[PDB]
Amino acid sequence: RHLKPFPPEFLWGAASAAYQVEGAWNEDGKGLSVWDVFAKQPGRTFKGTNGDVAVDHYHRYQEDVALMAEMGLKAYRFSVSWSRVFPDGNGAVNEKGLDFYDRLIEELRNHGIEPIVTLYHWDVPQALMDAYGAWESRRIIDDFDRYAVTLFQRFGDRVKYWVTLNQQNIFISFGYRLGLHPPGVKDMKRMYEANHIANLANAKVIQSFRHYVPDGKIGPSFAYSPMYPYDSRPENVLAFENAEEFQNHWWMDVYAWGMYPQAAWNYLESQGLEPTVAPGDWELLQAAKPDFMGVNYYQTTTVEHNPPDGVGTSSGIPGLFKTVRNPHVDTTNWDWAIDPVGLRIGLRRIANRYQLPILITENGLGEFDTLEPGDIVNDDYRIDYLRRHVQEIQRAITDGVDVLGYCAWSFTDLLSWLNGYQKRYGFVYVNRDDESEKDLRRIKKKSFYWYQRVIETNGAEL
């Protein structure tokens, strides 16, 4: 069988997130985000690392975009820091904050790079948390909408591709179930309420987008780990049904269809955990169809039967499923699976279930890169990982999946949320570590030139 080529306007991209790259945490009128405050709690982050400076992209954006142009990036996906635009979340707009993103967008456009604007990457202004608990209040729906509309009005003429909430399942679960991210809560009831409010905020902004950006394309981005059954034991296949619905359809069915899946809903209702539904909620969720599903992909998860007295290392839900190591995939140095075929499977599942085009918003390999003499970083491991995933994307396109683009994570090295800087993701090495910012100089890794070649040839050599 002949593989289809990557389509002529395929968005060969790379990506970042505002807190992870920008720095300038208190400059030009920017307000505190929940992450500014959270990361300064003693013991919260590795070696106290935080986003005060990060890799200083706020001041170094021209150099970074020049490197993107050298690579030939077709697209750069970044997030807008809400606290730069509305320092208090609501209230007065900050023109200096908007001006940064205007300058960034102009730099991208002048180099022929398509901006992909991500509205929300986990950094709600602290003032909204202080006033009303941020994502736990329906007040955020209108406040988020006002923020999104501001961006649509200022940039809609120059930005075609927009992502709304990026990895809602992560910021909600880590913030309200695991207590690892702000606000550090461990309460499933609160988690599902905040999640429902985030669903409504997503739908509201997509509705607004139709008014302000009539030729644009918008969608949420979901952190998707496709589930596998361990084997053909019926109870393991049933565990897979439970896991795919509870972990994945719980979000994507709301995004695509405006409806929560029923078995998961009934389980939550039996635990007293289902969210509070107000009149108009279903109408709003169902009327806000996205143009694409964004997918952040790193690995699949294999599951097996979990008795009601079982696991609550393996994780899972008693009576539903538990995770188990997949003996048939390679692993990273952090026990993450390497499963490029799993990306093809996830793309196929989204096309098969929702018939949506897909934008791959994040995929990449984190590793402890060594800077060798002469400013050389030989990251053949990153090249191998990316190559295998891009090859599987081409197979998915050949199968009939409409893949709009692929954003490698990340363009430059960046600050991780809790683990400092040493596990690096970039095509561009940034000379700093957990102890100091050093000189923050940018150094092209071997993978930079590999991806430059991929883009130049539209993937045709892989």
Next chain:
Amino acid sequence: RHLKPFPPEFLWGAASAAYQVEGAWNEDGKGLSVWDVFAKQPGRTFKGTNGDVAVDHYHRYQEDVALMAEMGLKAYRFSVSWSRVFPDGNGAVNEKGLDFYDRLIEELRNHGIEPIVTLYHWDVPQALMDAYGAWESRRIIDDFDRYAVTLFQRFGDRVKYWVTLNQQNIFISFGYRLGLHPPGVKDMKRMYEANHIANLANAKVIQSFRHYVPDGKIGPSFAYSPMYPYDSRPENVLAFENAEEFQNHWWMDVYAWGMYPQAAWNYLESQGLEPTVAPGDWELLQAAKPDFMGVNYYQTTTVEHNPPDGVGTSSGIPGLFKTVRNPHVDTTNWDWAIDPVGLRIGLRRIANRYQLPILITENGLGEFDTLEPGDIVNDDYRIDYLRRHVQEIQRAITDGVDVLGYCAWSFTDLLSWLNGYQKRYGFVYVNRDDESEKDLRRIKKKSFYWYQRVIETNGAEL
């Protein structure tokens, strides 16, 4: 987690098919069906058995319904023989034929049993095959519709529950791909064309039903073998994605959504096998939503990766999937799988994908039964099989699946299509075999009294 009860009006049922039960093949003006002709080809059926007499339900229906009432059946699902109603397929209606079904329905209603009328169980009149090739011609769409409308007009006041095509995937694949059933064709291109025409006929009759039976409930019934991947190897999970889409979504997505799945469509198109689509086809298919999905269930199927030079014993499609024996399920004495959990999985999949209620239209165990002196048939093996499946249905209901009822296959023993009478399915033994009709007497098996107790307790005592 305690199990939910069966809902108060759950349709505890049993089922049959006209050719398998009725006899009276040439009585009261009945025309030839394709099965009358096919089964009389020498060598086609075991010991030349055929439906001339079968178990003689046409003459013995009063006794059979009296037995249903003794059991306390809530519902009896049967099929109407098109050739009794329109002996030439189109043309003049045969009032004597309709009068048989009127008498049957009156007997059921007088005993408080819900009729479930199945429009089509594989017995298109031979005259339509002769005139235009039956299911290979779009002419059948209107002819089938005129037949269905006749039934809706005569019986819609007394019949709430209707099934349209029963096991379309079987009569189409066995008739046009495997050549096992009429018309005895082995041609995939013809198979997919006839299948598309059957899809249009199903949609047309559902549209007619909305006018003639506005308070009724209608759906197609699909012979569902849910697919499992052999293990968590990514290539085997991908084989599972392909197989579930090709074998199951190919039909059920058309029934529920009016759309063929895209990866399967593109594969067929690459082989020159996709059906011919006419203007208006998609609109019709999308405008005919059913009230429920009917499910005929016997077993799951496990699949694994199949190289492009591989299997086309194992069956499959090269480059997509091949079947493999599942080591984790039991087998019958005929080496077919027994997988009651697989029924729960299939029910969960239909609810999760389509949000449809499900009527289980067929499930049962075929086995040699021994008639012991005193008219005793001890079939504990059949009780075991049915009990395990009903238990899994109760678990699916507890999960949140809306199951409308369960029709055990079958009420009385019946004639099999190709294999005679000895592998029996009934709650009621019929005293005949492959060599003679004996006295055709009905003898209640042990399973009859077991199911009587199931119904009395609404499934609380299994």
